[PDB]
mmCIF file of C-alpha atoms in Angstrom:
data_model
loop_
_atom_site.group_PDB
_atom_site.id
_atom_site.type_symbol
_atom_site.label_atom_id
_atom_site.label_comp_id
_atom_site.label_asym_id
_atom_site.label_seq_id
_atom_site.Cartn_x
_atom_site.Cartn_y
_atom_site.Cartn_z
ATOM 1 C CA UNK A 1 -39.371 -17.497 16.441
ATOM 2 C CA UNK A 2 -40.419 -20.650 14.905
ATOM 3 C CA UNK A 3 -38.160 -22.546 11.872
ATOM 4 C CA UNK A 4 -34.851 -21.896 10.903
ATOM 5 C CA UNK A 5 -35.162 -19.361 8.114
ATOM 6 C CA UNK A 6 -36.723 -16.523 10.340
ATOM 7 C CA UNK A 7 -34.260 -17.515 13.150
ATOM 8 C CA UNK A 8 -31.458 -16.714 10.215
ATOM 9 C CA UNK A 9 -33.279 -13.954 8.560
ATOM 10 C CA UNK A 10 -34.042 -12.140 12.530
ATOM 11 C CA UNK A 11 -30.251 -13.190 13.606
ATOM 12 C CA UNK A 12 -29.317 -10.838 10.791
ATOM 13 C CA UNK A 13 -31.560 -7.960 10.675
ATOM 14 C CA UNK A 14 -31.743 -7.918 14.103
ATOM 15 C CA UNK A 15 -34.850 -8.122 16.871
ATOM 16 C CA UNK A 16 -35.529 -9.051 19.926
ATOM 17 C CA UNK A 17 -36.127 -13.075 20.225
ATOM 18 C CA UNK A 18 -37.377 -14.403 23.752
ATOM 19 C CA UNK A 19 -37.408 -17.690 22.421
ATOM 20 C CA UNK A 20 -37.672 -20.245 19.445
ATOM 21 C CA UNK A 21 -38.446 -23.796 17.987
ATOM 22 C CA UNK A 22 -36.684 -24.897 15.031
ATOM 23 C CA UNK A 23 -36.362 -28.536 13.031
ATOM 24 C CA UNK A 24 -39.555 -29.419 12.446
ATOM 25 C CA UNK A 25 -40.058 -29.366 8.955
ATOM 26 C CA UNK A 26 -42.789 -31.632 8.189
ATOM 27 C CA UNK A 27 -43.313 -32.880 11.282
ATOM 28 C CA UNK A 28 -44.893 -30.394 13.242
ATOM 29 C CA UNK A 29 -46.130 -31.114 16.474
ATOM 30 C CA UNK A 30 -48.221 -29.257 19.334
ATOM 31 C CA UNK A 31 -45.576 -30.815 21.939
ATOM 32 C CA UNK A 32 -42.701 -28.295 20.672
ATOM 33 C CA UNK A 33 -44.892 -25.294 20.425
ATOM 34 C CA UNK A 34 -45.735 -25.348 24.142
ATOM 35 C CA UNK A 35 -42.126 -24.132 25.206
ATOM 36 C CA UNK A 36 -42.580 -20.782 22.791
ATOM 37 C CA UNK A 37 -46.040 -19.939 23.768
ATOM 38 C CA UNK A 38 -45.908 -20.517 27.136
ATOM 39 C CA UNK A 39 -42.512 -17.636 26.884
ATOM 40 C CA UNK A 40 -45.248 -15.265 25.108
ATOM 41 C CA UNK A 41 -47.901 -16.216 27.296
ATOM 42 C CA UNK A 42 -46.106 -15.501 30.524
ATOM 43 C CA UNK A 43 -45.001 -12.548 29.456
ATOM 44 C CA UNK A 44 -48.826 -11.334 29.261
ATOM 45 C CA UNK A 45 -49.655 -12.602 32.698
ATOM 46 C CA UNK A 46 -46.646 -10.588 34.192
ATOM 47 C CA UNK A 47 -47.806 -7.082 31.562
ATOM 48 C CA UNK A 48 -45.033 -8.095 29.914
ATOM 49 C CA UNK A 49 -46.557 -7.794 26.262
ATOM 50 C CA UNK A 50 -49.967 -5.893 25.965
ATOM 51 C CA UNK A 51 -50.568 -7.990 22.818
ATOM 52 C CA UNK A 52 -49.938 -11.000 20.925
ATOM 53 C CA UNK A 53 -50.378 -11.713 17.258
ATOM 54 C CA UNK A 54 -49.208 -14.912 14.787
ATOM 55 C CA UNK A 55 -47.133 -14.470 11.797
ATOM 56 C CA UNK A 56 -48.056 -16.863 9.214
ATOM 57 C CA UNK A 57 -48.676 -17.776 5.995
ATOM 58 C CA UNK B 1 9.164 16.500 -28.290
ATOM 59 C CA UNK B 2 12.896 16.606 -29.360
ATOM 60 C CA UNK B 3 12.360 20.445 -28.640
ATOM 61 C CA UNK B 4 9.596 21.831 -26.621
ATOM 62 C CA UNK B 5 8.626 19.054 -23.863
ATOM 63 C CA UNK B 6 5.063 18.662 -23.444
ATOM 64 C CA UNK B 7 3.099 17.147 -26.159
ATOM 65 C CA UNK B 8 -0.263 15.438 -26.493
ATOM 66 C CA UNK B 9 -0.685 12.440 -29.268
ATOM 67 C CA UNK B 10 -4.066 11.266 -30.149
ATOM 68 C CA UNK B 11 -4.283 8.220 -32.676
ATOM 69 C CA UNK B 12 -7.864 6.816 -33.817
ATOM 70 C CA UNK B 13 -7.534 3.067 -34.483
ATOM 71 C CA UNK B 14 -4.194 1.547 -34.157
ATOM 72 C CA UNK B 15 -5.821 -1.419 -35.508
ATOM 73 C CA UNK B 16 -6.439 0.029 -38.549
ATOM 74 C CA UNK B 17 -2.558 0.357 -39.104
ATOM 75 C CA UNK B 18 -2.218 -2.771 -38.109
ATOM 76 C CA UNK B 19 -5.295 -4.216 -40.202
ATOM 77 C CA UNK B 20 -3.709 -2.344 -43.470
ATOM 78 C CA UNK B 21 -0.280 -4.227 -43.012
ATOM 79 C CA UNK B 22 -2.864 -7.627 -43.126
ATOM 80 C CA UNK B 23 -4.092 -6.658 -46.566
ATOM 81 C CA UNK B 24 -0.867 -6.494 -47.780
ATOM 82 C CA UNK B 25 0.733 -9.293 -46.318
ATOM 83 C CA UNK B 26 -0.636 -12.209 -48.546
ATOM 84 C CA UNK B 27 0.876 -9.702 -51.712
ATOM 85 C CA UNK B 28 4.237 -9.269 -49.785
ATOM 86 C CA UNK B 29 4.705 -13.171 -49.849
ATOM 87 C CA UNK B 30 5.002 -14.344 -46.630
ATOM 88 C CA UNK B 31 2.995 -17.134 -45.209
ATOM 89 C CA UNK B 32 0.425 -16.204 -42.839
ATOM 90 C CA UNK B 33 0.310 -16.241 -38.769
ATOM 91 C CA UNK B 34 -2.349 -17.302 -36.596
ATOM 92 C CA UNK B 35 -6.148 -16.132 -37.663
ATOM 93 C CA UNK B 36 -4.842 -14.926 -41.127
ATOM 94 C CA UNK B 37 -2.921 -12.429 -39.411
ATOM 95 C CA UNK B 38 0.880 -11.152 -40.653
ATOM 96 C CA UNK B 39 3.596 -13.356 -38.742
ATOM 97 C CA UNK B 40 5.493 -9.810 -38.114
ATOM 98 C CA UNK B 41 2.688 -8.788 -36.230
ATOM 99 C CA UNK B 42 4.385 -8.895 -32.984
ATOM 100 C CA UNK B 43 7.150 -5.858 -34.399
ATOM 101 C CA UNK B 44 4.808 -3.922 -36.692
ATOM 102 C CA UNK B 45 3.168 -2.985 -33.794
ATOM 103 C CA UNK B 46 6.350 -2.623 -31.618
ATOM 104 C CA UNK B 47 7.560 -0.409 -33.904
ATOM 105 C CA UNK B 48 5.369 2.213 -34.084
ATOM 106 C CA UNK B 49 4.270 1.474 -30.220
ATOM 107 C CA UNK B 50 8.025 2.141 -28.992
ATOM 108 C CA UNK B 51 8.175 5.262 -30.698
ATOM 109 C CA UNK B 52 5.575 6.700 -28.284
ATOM 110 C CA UNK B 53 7.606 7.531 -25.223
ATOM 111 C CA UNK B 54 8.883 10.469 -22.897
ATOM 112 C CA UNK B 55 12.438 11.680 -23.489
ATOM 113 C CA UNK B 56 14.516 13.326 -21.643
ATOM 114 C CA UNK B 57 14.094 16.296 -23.470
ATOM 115 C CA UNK B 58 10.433 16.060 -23.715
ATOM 116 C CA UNK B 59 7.177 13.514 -22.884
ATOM 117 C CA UNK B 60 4.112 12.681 -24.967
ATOM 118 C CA UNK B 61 1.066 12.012 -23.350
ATOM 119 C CA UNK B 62 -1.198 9.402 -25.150
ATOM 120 C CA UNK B 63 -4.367 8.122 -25.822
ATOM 121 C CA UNK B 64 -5.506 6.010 -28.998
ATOM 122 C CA UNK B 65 -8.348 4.221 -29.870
ATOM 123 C CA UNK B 66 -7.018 0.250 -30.195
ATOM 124 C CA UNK B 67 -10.291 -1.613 -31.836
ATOM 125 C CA UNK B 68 -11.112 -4.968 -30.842
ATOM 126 C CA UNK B 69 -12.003 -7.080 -33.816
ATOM 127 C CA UNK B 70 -15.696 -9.205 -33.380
ATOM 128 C CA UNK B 71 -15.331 -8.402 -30.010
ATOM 129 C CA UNK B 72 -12.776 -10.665 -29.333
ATOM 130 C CA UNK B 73 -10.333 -9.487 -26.949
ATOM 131 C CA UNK B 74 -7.642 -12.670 -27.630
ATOM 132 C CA UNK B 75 -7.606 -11.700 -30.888
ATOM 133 C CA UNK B 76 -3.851 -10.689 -31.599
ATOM 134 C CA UNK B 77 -4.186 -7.226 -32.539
ATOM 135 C CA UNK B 78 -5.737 -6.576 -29.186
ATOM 136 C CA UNK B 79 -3.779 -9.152 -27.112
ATOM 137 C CA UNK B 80 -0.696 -8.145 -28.233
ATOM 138 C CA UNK B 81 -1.374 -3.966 -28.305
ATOM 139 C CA UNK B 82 -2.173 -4.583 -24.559
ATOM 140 C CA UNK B 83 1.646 -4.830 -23.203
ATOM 141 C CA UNK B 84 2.335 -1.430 -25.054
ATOM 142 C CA UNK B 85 0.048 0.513 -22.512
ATOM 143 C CA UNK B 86 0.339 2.240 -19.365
ATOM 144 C CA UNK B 87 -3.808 2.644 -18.386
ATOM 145 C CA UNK B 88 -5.884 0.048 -20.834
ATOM 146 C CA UNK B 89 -9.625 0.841 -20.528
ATOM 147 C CA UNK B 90 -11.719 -1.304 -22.317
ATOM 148 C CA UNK B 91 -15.279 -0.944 -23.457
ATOM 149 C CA UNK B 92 -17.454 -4.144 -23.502
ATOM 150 C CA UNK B 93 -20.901 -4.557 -25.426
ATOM 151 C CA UNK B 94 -22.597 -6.242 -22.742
ATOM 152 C CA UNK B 95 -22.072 -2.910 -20.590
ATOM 153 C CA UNK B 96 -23.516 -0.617 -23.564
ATOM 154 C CA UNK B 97 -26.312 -3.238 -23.850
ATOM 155 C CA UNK B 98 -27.535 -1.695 -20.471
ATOM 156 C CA UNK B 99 -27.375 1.828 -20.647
ATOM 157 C CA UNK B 100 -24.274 2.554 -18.817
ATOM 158 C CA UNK B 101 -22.527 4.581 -21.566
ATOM 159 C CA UNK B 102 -18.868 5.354 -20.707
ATOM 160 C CA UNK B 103 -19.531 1.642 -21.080
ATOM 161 C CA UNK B 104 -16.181 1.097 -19.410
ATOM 162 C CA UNK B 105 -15.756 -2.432 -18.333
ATOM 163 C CA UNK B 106 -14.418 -1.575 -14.729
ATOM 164 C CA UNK B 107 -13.424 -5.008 -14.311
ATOM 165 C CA UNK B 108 -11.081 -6.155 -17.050
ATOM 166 C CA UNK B 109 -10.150 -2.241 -17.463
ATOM 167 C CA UNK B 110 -6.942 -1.545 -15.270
ATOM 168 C CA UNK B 111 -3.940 1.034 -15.131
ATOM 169 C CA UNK B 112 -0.351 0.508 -14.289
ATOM 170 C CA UNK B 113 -0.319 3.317 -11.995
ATOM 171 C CA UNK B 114 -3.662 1.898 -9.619
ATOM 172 C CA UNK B 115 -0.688 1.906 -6.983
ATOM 173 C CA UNK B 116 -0.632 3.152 -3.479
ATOM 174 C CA UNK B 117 2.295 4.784 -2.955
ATOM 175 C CA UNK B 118 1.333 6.737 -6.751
ATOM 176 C CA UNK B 119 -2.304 7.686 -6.169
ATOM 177 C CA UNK B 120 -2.396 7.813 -2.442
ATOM 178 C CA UNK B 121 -3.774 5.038 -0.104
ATOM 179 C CA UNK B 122 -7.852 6.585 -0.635
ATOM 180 C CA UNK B 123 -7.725 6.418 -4.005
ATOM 181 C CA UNK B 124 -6.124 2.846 -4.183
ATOM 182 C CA UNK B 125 -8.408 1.129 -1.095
ATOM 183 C CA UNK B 126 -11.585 2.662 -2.837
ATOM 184 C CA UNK B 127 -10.709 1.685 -6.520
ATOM 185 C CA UNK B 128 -10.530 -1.706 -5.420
ATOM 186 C CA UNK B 129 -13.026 -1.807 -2.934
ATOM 187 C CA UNK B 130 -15.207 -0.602 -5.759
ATOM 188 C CA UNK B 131 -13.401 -3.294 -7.924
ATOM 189 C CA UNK B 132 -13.725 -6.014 -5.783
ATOM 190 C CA UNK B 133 -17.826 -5.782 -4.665
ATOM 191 C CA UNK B 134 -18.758 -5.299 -7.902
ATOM 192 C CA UNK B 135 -16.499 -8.842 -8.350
ATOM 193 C CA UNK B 136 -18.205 -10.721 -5.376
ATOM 194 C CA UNK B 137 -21.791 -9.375 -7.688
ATOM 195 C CA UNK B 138 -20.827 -11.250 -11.082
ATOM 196 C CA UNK B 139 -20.403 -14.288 -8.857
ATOM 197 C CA UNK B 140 -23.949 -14.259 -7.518
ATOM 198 C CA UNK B 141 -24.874 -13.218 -10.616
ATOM 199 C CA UNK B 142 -25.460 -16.813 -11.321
ATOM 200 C CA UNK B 143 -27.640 -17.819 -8.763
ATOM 201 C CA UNK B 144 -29.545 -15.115 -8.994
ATOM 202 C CA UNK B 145 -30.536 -16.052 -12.891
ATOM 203 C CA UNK B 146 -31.259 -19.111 -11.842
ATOM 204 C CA UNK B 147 -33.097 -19.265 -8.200
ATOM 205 C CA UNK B 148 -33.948 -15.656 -7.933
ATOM 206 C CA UNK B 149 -32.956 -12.674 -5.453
ATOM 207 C CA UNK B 150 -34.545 -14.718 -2.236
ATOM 208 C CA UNK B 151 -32.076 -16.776 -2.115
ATOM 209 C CA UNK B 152 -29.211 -14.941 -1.381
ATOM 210 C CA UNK B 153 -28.214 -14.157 2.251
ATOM 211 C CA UNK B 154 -29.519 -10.783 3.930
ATOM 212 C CA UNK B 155 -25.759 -9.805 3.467
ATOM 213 C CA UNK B 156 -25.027 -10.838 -0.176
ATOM 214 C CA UNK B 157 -28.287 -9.054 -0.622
ATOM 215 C CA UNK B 158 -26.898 -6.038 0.194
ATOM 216 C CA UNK B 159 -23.899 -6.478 -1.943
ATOM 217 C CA UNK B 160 -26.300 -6.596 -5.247
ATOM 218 C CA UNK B 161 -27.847 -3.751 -4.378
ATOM 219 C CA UNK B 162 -25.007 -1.648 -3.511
ATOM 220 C CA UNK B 163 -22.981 -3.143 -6.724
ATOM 221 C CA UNK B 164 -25.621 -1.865 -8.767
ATOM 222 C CA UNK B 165 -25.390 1.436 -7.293
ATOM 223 C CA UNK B 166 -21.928 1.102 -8.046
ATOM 224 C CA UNK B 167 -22.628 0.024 -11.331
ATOM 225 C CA UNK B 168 -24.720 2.943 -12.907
ATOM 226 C CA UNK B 169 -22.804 5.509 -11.193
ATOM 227 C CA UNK B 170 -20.094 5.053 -13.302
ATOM 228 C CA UNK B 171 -22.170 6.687 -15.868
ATOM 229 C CA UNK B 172 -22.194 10.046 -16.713
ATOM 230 C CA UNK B 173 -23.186 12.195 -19.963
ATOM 231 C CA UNK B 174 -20.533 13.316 -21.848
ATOM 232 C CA UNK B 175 -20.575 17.088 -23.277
ATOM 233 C CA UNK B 176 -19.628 15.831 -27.121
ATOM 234 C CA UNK B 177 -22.211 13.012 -26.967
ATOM 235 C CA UNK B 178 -25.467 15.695 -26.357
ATOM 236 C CA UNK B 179 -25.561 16.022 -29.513
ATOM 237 C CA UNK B 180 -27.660 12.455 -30.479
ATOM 238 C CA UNK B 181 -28.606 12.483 -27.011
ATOM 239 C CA UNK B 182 -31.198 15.217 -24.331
ATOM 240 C CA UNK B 183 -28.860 14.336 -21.634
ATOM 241 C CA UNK B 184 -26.363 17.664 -21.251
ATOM 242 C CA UNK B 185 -22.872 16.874 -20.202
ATOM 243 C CA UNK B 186 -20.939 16.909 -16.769
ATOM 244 C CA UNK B 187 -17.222 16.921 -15.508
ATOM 245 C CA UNK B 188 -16.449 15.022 -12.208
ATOM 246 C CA UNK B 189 -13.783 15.843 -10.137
ATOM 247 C CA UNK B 190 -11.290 13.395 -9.394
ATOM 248 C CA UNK B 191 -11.692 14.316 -5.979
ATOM 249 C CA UNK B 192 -15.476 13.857 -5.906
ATOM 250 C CA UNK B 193 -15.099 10.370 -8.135
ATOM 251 C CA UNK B 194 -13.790 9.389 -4.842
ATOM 252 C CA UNK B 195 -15.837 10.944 -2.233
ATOM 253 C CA UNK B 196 -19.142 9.679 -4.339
ATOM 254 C CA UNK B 197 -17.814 5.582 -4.941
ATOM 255 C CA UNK B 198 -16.120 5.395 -1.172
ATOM 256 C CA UNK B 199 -19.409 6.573 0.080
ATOM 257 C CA UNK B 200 -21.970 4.292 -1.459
ATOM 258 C CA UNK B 201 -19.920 1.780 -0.113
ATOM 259 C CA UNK B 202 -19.361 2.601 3.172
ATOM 260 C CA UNK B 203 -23.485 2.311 3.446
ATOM 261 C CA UNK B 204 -23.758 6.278 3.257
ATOM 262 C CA UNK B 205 -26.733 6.579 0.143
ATOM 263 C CA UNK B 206 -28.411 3.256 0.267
ATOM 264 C CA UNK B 207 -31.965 4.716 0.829
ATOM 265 C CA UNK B 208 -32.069 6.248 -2.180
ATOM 266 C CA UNK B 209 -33.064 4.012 -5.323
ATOM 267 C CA UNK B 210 -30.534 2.923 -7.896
ATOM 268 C CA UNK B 211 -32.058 5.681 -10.851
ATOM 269 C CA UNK B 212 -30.895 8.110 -8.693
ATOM 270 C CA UNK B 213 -27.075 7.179 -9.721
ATOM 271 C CA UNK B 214 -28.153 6.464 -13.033
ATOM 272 C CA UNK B 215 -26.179 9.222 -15.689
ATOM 273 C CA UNK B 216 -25.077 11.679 -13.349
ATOM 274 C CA UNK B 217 -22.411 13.881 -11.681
ATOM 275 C CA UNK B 218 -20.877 14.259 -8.485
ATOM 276 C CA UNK B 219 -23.017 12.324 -5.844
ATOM 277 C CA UNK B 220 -25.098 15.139 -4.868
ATOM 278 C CA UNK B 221 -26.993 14.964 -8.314
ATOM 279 C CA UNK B 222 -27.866 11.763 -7.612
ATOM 280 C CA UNK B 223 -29.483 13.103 -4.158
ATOM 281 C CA UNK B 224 -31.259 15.521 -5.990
ATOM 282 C CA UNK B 225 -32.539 13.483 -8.558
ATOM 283 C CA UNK B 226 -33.666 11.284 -6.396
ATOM 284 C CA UNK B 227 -36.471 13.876 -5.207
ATOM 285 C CA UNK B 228 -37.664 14.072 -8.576
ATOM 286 C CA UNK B 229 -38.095 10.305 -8.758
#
């Protein structure tokens, strides 16, 4: 998960979150997306996750 | 009633008694009360109202049709007739304006006998529960004009939606009204009024889309109707 509103919006309807990075806002940096990808990323090394897509705008 | 006990009294327009005693006021000579109104308003009605009652050697049961002048329920006729009732159910424009049309305000509509140890503890718990989401949806009903449906949280979302369930399932097409109207009457149990209204809101029949409640009968109409569209 990445920003506070689908943190909220999962923490309600539920799901599964392995990890997150929140507080940016228009500041957005490639230093505080390592952490998140490197979860997802790991996660297909190991056969973890079989695939890995972006949600975005 | 002073002979055989059990009678039934139906009175259209108290107000127009009432209203009649107005007209004649100004000729009777006495000065005039608030809004134009007779300054024995407050006994004319009493009057009449008191006579209305159960004996001991026999009851009348009750129901009259008390108009509300301009809309304006603090006008005196109405604010006054008010204290005289047992169950006051009270029709509002804005409700009629929708489509909903026992347009029964169920908010400012009450009884005296809404009371647990009267109407059982299911009855009670699911007239208020009923009573108070549909409450917590006027609120919102502000922010919602204003910022739109996104706004609200994921839970208060939920609340509109089953409010508004809520809302047009209090509908239902009366037999005397098919007359101006396709829609052929129904009779609800009181027993299914509850099984219906404490089901929506325990989450039971959200799937289904609000026209399904929309001018129906017991709840399984509104599941069937909901197949058709």
């Amino acid at each position: 998960m990445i920003g506070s509103k689908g943190v909220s919006f999962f923490n309600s309807v539920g799901g599964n979150v392995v990890a997150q990075v929140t507080g940016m806002g228009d500041n957005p940096s490639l230093s505080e997306l390592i952490g998140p990808v490197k979860v997802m990323l790991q996660a297909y090394d190991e056969g973890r996750l079989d695939k890995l897509y972006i949600v975005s705008n | 009633r002073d002979e055989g006990r059990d009678v039934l009294l139906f009175v259209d327009n108290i107000y127009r008694y009432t209203l009649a005693g107005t007209e004649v006021s100004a000729l009777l000579g006495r000065m005039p009360s608030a809004v134009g109104y007779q300054p024995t308003l407050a006994e004319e009605m009493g009057v009449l109202q008191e006579r209305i009652t159960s004996t001991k050697t026999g009851s009348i049961t009750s129901v009259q049709a008390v108009y509300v002048p301009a809309d304006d329920l603090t006008d005196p006729s109405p604010a006054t007739t008010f204290a005289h009732l047992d169950a006051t159910v009270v029709l509002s424009r804005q409700i009629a304006s929708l489509g909903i049309y026992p347009a029964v305000d169920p908010l400012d509509s009450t009884s005296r006998q809404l009371d647990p140890l009267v109407v059982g503890q299911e009855h009670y718990d699911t007239a208020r529960g009923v009573q108070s989401i549909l409450q917590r949806y006027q609120e919102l009903k502000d922010i919602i004009a204003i910022l739109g449906m996104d706004e609200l949280s994921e839970e208060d979302k939920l609340v509109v939606a089953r409010a508004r369930k809520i809302q047009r399932f209090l509908s239902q097409p009366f037999f005397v009204a098919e007359v101006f109207t396709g829609s052929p009457g129904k009779y609800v149990s009181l027993k299914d009024t509850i099984r219906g209204f404490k089901g929506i809101m325990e989450g039971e029949y959200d799937h289904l889309p609000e026209q399904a409640f929309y001018m129906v009968g017991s709840i399984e109409e509104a599941v069937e109707k909901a197949k058709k569209l």
